[PDB]
Symmetry: C3
Subunit: 306 residues, 3 copies
């Protein structure tokens, strides 16, 4: 089993400095040794340097860094597509969540029947017409879902995207901070999600059972796990840009990752939004990075029973 | 929907200074803006000034401030009764829990078929003959329950009080610090409760289901939610007078409030025992107040899925 | 109901200084008063002084202090045997977990059909041939299980030990840090365990129900509860030698202890691995000791409903 690791020090999907240091932080927390110990053959692509775009003015006076986000994602997609085509399960370290535009595009370029498990406090499904922040890290799913495209305008730097993934092929876990237009979208397009309230009711075991029945209950499909560290409670993952109280416990996060591993179908994984600069202490920074490593390792087979 | 907000800075139901500043702390945490954002039409009564009673000596050399507690509650009951009669859902900010004598009395005046959900680490059902502290905030239920009245002595300042509620019409959630005479009372009078142990066994979803079956299983009734912030684990609500380890999680507390809102039957709510002076840091005081606001907002419709 | 308390300030089953101060820390947290208040008649044996062994050199260049651990356990077994023979439920305060060799051996002398509930982050079932640390506190179960004895070499100081119980007579609860040889042993000998993952799935109520069905489902048996404080999440029990993230919550630990009491069969209890010197603050040391007292008190009848 072979794993590719790509650092994507992405910060222009949002406004807070420091998230570009996520990949280094996760690596420093021992990611590569942990994967090796599990028996993963590794190819490290290092941390990418993305091509800058001159005069990348706001789109519609609101959407920030659109060409820079578009181009960085186009470049990322090429690296991801090549890794997956070469037989690697592809781990991308963020960086802000706008990079999932590139990792999912690149993954789908080799594996068009992929499904997505999106683990996050947020749905990240605002469009350029509904976002109240202008930050592309809160919009990436809108560019990817086929059924939404007639409601998503063409941004500069975004023309290369081919959104063929169905709204029936993504399931959210963890949701507790959803903007009203996002809620409208989830309901109107019948997109399946398990909010923190659903987890409180069902328990994480049944959440994972139902998630897989929805996505792979009829046929085996490669799985893309896009994991925003802010899915965890801020007490566990404080070093992140949009923390929301009442999140996943450590055990719940490990359980999600274990069930992902147990499918035997994990094909790519994003671990995004670790921002070491937002920690109030080096301890807070390190615990957040340690947690990120635990998620990735559990997704590739680390168990609690040995 | 119209919501009345009443500050009741009572402290004389107990001995620790500062709980009178609970209402202010909860306001400062953004309560009014939060309720407005949900669509609530608001009538703010401000913080009431209760008539003092000079030389309010101990009763039976134990009971603390009985005439003051009795009179403040008579005054509060009139304000609550008037607000309910004007069609408001009544939110009362404490202040110590002895104020529930007044809010439930005032509420029952126009809604005699009300039921009570009492969320608390404690049962608050000692009588003047069983209390070992003398503090009236640990006795309010004893004055309210019809079945107990031949066991409750007449206190100075308490003659206006009629027991309004049957023992079958209150359910406790959260109990973990119960005095032996209270346990005797709960068992002897078949009063229904879900202790922290019951929550550990059933899960909060089932606890709320059974709570409503017990109270509103046969008919719709107005609901009085009396919520003591100390129901929450002290790590979440440290600024309170009688913290007890092993409490509700943030998620459980939100779930309770959501289920209350989902009945469509919430008619009055108490949020008591926030004492900002007992915080060891201003952060501890603020987080307790923020949590109080979260409870009240969720009880009137704030959701985690937006 | 009579309870014996034995301090066993064992440290030579491992390499970190300070665990020998565990018994004092637990006593200082109010253990004896708490047990008396529940109605337990107490015999305090004090803290034992074990006979040292000169030149207690490594066995096989790896196993640390074998003669010292062997002799201390022989001496402890004598005290536990006497206390059980005199009709006391025997509480032993550690000290490192190698002391369970002595307490279970002593207990089994008069109560050979005892069963063991082993609450721990670890299985402690390495043998002298599988341990990678050499630390006997991670090996005690290997010496106790009859099915394993063809695989357990004879250590100096260990000749007195007769493998007491069957592999079908121990159930683990809480496991999350298991060495590969231990995992092999648990599987190969069909030893039943509930890892943290199993708890996440089943809930602690079902875990206790199934534990009792496995051990006492068809006959009543005296229970030996061997409780390593590291079963709890390190946020709750930081003062311990081998903390592992993702442990039991406070409520889960109380529930386990409550169920043990509810069987009416508790015959001996170990509370081990509290090391106050490993706390980073006095508060960390005290909360760990306080938790130890709560476990013991709940195991002997302290309830959360009064
Ligand atoms: C929920 N929507 C937000 C947050 C996006 C977080 C991105 B992710 O990668 O971390 O999950 C926030 C919108 N709210 C901000 C606060 C005021 C109300 C709107 C947005 O900026 O779109
Ligand atoms: C449980 N009963 C107590 C606490 C009441 C808390 C009031 B509430 O509004 O906050 O829920 C405490 C009884 N004491 C007996 C043993 C010594 C300390 C507690 C009392 O004072 O009656
Ligand atoms: C899991 N086995 C360990 C820990 C024993 C803990 C003893 B107990 O009483 O506290 O539960 C550790 C094995 N090591 C192997 C990998 C490197 C670090 C741990 C051992 O030393 O045998
Ligand atoms: Mn997020
Ligand atoms: Mn995200
Ligand atoms: Mn209380
Ligand atoms: Mn109360
Ligand atoms: Mn252990
Ligand atoms: Mn142990």
């Amino acid at each position: 089993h072979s794993v590719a690791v790509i650092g994507a020090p992405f910060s222009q999907g949002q406004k807070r400095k420091g998230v570009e240091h996520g990949p280094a932080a996760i690596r420093e927390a021992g990611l590569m040794k942990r994967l090796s110990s599990l028996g993963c053959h590794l190819k490290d692509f290092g941390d990418l340097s993305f091509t800058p775009v001159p005069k990348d003015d706001l789109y519609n006076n609101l959407i920030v860094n659109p060409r820079s986000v578009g181009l960085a994602n186009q470049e990322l997609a090429e690296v991801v597509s090549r890794a997956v085509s070469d037989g690697y399960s592809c781990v991308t370290l963020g960086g802000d969540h706008s990079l999932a535009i590139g990792t999912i595009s690149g993954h789908a370029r080799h594996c068009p029947d992929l499904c997505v498990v999106w683990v996050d406090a947020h749905a990240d499904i605002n469009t350029p017409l509904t976002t109240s922040s202008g930050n592309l890290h809160g919009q990436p799913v809108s560019f990817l879902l086929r059924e939404l495209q007639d409601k998503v305008p063409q941004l500069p730097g975004f023309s290369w995207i081919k959104p063929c993934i169905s709204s029936a092929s993504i399931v959210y876990i963890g949701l507790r901070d959803v903007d009203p237009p996002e809620h409208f979208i989830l309901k109107n397009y019948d997109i399946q999600y398990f909010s923190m309230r659903d987890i409180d009711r069902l328990g994480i075991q049944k959440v994972m059972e139902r998630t897989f029945d929805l996505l792979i209950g009829k046929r085996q499909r490669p799985i893309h796990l896009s994991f925003d560290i802010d899915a965890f409670d801020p007490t566990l993952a404080p070093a992140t840009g949009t923390p929301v109280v009442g999140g996943l416990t450590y055990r719940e996060g490990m359980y999600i990752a274990e069930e992902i591993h147990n499918t035997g179908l994990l094909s790519a994984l994003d671990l995004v939004e670790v921002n070491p600069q937002l920690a109030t202490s080096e301890e807070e920074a390190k615990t957040t990075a340690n947690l990120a490593v635990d998620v990735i390792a559990s997704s590739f087979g680390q168990t609690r029973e040995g």
